[PDB]
Design a protein around this ligand. Structure first.
Ligand code: HEM
Ligand code: HEM
Ligand SMILES: Cc1cc(N)nc(C[C@@H]2CNC[C@@H]2OCCNCCc2cccc(F)c2)c1
Ligand SMILES: Cc1cc(N)nc(C[C@@H]2CNC[C@@H]2OCCNCCc2cccc(F)c2)c1
Ligand SMILES: C[C@H](O)[C@H](O)[C@H]1CNc2nc(N)[nH]c(=O)c2N1
Ligand SMILES: C[C@H](O)[C@H](O)[C@H]1CNc2nc(N)[nH]c(=O)c2N1
Ligand SMILES: [Zn+2]
Lengths: 411, 409
């Protein structure tokens, strides 16, 4: 099978063969497409094929497929699985696996960077205090005083599913949200439930608009424990606008380090339920989504008020005007503070170069158009015009449900 | 079998059951999603189940399912197919079919309007000259001096497929494009090929930037013929800006009537290969796509220059600033000239309301999120946050390829 994708702006046509390596299901069928649906212990029987597939991929990548070292490693893993029902990755395999999970992440526009990823091996961690220290070190390393460096920290893998490591936070750094009696929210409305969990667990909340949440960390399937990230490790950027001097008095700021902590990393059939990773922001994430979603900080009205825009009719495009100015502010602010950030134009242009490279050297690049096209100015980015094929390759990152729904409280 | 769609802004969850009446292939499989791919005769045996399927839904819709009139019609149609190899729709069936093809159009944000569609039955048409007359009357009816009204004109159905009616144009009203010795393009770069075929057939091209193309009409499978729409039926709008006095000096205009003319209408297995339809513009179509695509009029650079924005770096968001201004100008110009237009905020709000009606009254609404979300400001519109299921129902509009590949002269 050879599948073609066309770019409707350039007429460049690419041929995908990599989709033949794809195993898992998409959610779609011949009768229904679920491309806009957000959410569309293994036995020893299913584990060895998965291990073998991965090791075969690894050894081919190091140009040693079929070698004694490759054959010896297959035999070693087979013997480990039959005897212990699982196996341990070599450090080399773990690094390869985490880089490839990123390379394979079809919703990620930043993948040009995939091969530059600092992997912190935390498989010797045993307690939540230990997880805390590893996470502090990750944050300090990734932050690098504003010169952000991509990184991932990998905690011990699933055993029986009763002893999971989990970070309960969806991101290492996020602001608290507090639902008021009058139904208004102070802070980030996305984090209300988790903020209530933290408070119930003993957190003394400052009750302000930008309170950095504590970490809630679960080690070895035990009840999670609270830790406050040292404030001096949490780099923030006050938001100001290059022309509008009143922009600063909105009181906005955001944190520099986007660090996803709720995903599951699968490598060779092994499952890493705690694998916080971080890169740097594309400006629209903050300026479009975090600030302007109706369910988030929701600042459009206040910004448009201050700009003296005509707010009586949507057709004046006041929302669109205010949106651009907020996104100028975010980029200006990060740039003026020398904190790494990428604009949506630059990022999408780099993504297209990455995708074309991947088609030539790999035979494809699975991509999720719904997520790759930025949430403002869609069609003035080159990705809008690029047809994409979405399919699932392993190693991979997967969404996992919040642990408060599934955890067995021990007390 | 019972699929849920969630809205992530509102937490409203809807249950889709309509997808089980889905028929044709999506292009997706369990292994690969082709959601972003633009392009993912009937024998007596294939035709009767298609007719029955349609007639059943029709008789169902007027609450006469399993009635004598239902069975009598199914009998009549079966007789007609068996003896004639095709059949003819009753006027009522044709109106219902066309409205439902619009209702079923998964890529259409304006479907809240679907039941208000004027259907012009042009199945008695026999010549290209007749086609031209029907099309001018559609144009004048739909335009209505700027108070636009949705309409479709339906020409004779495919027979053996060697006698197809086709409007060669992709829309009834579009501007010409010409390659220049200088290397650049004058006019709409999208229409360069069509314009060459027009001149090749005899059209005397004015060679300007906004030359309304002539129609190339094909009747009964003959060679297409050229007709010019009367200039006074083509309502155009000069583009100006409410703040920027200089905007009018770019010399931009667009036409008021969006009228798609290259699709195939399938009703009850019958195929209507010439079925031009029109509604009214959503402003982003002109302001974002027609004006700002790099492969189109590509005017962002000129506008940014006149706004004196910092164009040295992408992170100044000069493209995005200029984009908003162009789209403000489009809406203001149409509104000032009293030509119906809808902004993307209003259209998408209407569509969410339409989806909710369709889930409650029909059990679902097929929708293609890639097309439904506006090409600018996506997430500040409510459709960005709405999960949608995409599936193909009939009656349907299907894209068909340009006939100049098909045709033999
Ligand atoms: C180097 C800077 C990076 C940039 C600019 C970037 C850009 C983005 C953006 C804009 C998204 C969508 C985010 C959202 O809408 O929630 C995303 C998604 C994602 N990225 Fe990246 N990315 C970067 C680095 C990384 C790294 C280091 C990894 C892992 C090693 C990663 C893996 C992922 C995954 C798994 C998703 C999907 C997240 C989900 O399902 O919620 N990315 N990327
Ligand atoms: C009443 C005003 C209408 C509005 C505001 C509207 C809105 C739109 C928009 C914005 C698109 C995408 C256009 C593009 O990006 O090329 C579209 C697509 C479409 N609409 Fe509508 N629509 C309207 C009326 C109609 C009518 C009257 C019909 C048929 C009777 C129709 C059927 C379709 C079809 C079949 C498509 C997909 C076209 C293609 O594949 O190129 N729409 N609609
Ligand atoms: C329901 C659901 C499924 C899913 N797969 N994912 C989510 C997280 C949502 C996606 N959209 C908003 C929120 O995610 C917010 C955090 N996203 C940052 C991704 C990123 C960016 C730069 C560098 C990085 F290392 C990581 C929710
Ligand atoms: C390759 C291909 C496939 C396809 N299905 N379609 C196309 C036409 C392209 C799509 N996008 C731009 C151009 O279509 C432009 C015409 N679209 C207007 C739709 C519309 C709006 C309002 C009222 C109406 F009656 C109709 C190309
Ligand atoms: C319903 C829809 O799939 C959902 O709103 C998506 C759309 N595209 C997205 N794209 C990105 N990058 N992040 C998101 O959270 C979303 N949300
Ligand atoms: C490749 C991609 O599917 C293509 O550019 C689409 C994206 N979404 C669209 N949406 C609309 N309404 N119209 C279009 O022409 C397109 N083009
Ligand atoms: Zn799909």
């Amino acid at each position: 099978r050879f599948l073609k994708v066309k770019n409707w702006e350039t007429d460049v046509v690419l041929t995908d063969t990599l989709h033949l390596k794809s195993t898992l299901e998409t959610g779609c069928t011949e009768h229904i497409c679920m491309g806009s649906i957000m959410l569309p212990v293994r036995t020893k029987d299913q584990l060895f094929p998965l291990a073998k597939e991965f090791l075969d991929q690894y050894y081919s990548s190091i140009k040693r497929f079929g070698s004694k070292a490759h054959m010896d490693r297959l035999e070693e893993v087979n013997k480990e699985i039959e005897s212990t029902s699982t196996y341990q990755l070599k450090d080399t395999e773990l690094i390869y696996g985490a880089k490839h999970a990123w390379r394979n992440a079809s919703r990620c526009v930043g993948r040009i960077q995939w091969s530059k990823l600092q992997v912190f091996d935390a498989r010797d961690c045993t307690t939540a205090h230990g997880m805390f220290n590893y996470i502090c070190n990750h944050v300090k390393y990734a932050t690098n005083k504003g010169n952000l460096r991509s990184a991932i920290t990998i905690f011990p893998q699933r055993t029986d599913g009763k002893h999971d490591f989990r970070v309960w936070n969806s991101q290492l750094i996020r602001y608290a949200g507090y639902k008021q009696p009058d139904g208004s929210t102070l802070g980030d409305p996305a984090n209300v439930q988790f903020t209530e969990i933290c408070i119930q667990q003993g957190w003394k909340a400052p009750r302000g608009r930008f309170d950095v949440l504590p970490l809630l960390l679960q080690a070895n399937g035990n009840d999670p424990e609270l830790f406050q990230i040292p404030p001096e490790l949490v780099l923030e950027v006050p938001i100001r606008h290059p022309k509008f001097d009143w922009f600063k008095d909105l009181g906005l700021k955001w944190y520099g380090l986007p660090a996803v902590s709720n995903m599951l990393l699968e490598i060779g059939g092994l499952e890493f339920s705690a694998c916080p990773f971080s890169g740097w922001y594309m400006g629209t994430e903050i300026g479009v989504r975090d600030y302007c979603d109706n369910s988030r900080y929701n600042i459009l009205e206040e910004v448009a008020k201050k700009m003296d825009l005509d707010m009586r009719k949507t057709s004046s495009l006041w929302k669109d005007q205010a949106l651009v100015e907020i996104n100028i502010a975010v980029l200006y602010s990060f740039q003026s503070d020398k904190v790494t950030i990428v604009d949506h134009h630059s990022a999408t242009e780099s993504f297209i170069k990455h995708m074309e490279n991947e088609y030539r050297c790999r035979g494809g690049c699975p991509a999720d158009w719904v997520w790759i096209v930025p949430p403002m100015s869609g069609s003035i980015t080159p990705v809008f015009h690029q047809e994409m094929l979405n399919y699932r390759l392993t190693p991979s990152f997967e969404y996992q449900p919040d642990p408060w729904n599934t955890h067995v409280w021990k007390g």
